[PDB]
Amino acid sequence: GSMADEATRRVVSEIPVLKTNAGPRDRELWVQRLKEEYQSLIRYVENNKNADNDWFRLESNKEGTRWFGKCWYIHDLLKYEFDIEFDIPITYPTTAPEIAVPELDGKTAKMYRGGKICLTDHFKPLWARNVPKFGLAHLMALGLGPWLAVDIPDLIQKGVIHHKEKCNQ
Ligand code: NA
């Protein structure tokens, strides 16, 4: 609908779109896809810094098949930090990667096996109708971003998680 399309555009308008339909086994086409992935990620990060919302770091192994980093979330002037990681599915970019936040695994009934976060029923269709334009920057912006803004406040209220540090120090 009009609202979904507009809401998606608002979030990802200045994130570079990806082109190459290639997964981790596609050799020279995967190398090109990885270039588009890094191009998109770094511009997203650069845009986030200018918006005082620099909220994650990601790096990959040599092959670009395993990604890892951290995300940060600010709530009531306290800063929360979480390790994140995912593997690239063989059928990516058609199949979205599954984000794990391993330190929350077994610790909350929000986690699937391997500390994998549950995105909403609307994430997979949204990803599906954008293949192959969406990449890891879009997984962060449209998947993990909204997840932090729902689930982290909830875990703080339930007293499941503690902070790392105060904000403006
Ligand atoms: Na979850």
Swiss-Prot record:
Ufmylated at Lys-124. Deufmylated by UFSP1. CDD domains: UBCc_UFC1 (cd11686). One of its GO terms (biological process) is regulation of type II interferon production. Changing residue 112 to A: Decreased UFM1 transfer. The keyword Ubl conjugation applies. Pfam families: UFC1. GO terms for molecular function: UFM1 conjugating enzyme activity; UFM1 transferase activity. Keywords: Disease variant, Isopeptide bond, Ubl conjugation, Ubl conjugation pathway. Changing residue 35 to A: Impairs binding to UBA5 and thioester formation with UFM1. Changing residue 118 to S: Instead of the formation of an intermediate complex with a thiol ester bond between UFC1 (E2-like enzyme) and UFM1 (substrate), a stable complex with an O-ester bond is formed. In absence of UBA5, the active site is solvated by water molecules thereby reducing its nucleophilic activity. A linker region of UBA5 is required to reduce the amount of water molecules in the vicinity of the active site and elevate its nucleophilic activity. E2-like enzyme which specifically catalyzes the second step in ufmylation. Accepts the ubiquitin-like modifier UFM1 from the E1 enzyme UBA5 and forms an intermediate with UFM1 via a thioester linkage. Ufmylation is involved in various processes, such as ribosome recycling, response to DNA damage, interferon response or reticulophagy (also called ER-phagy). This is Ubiquitin-fold modifier-conjugating enzyme 1. It comes from Homo sapiens (Human). The lineage of its organism: Eukaryota, Metazoa, Chordata, Craniata, Vertebrata.
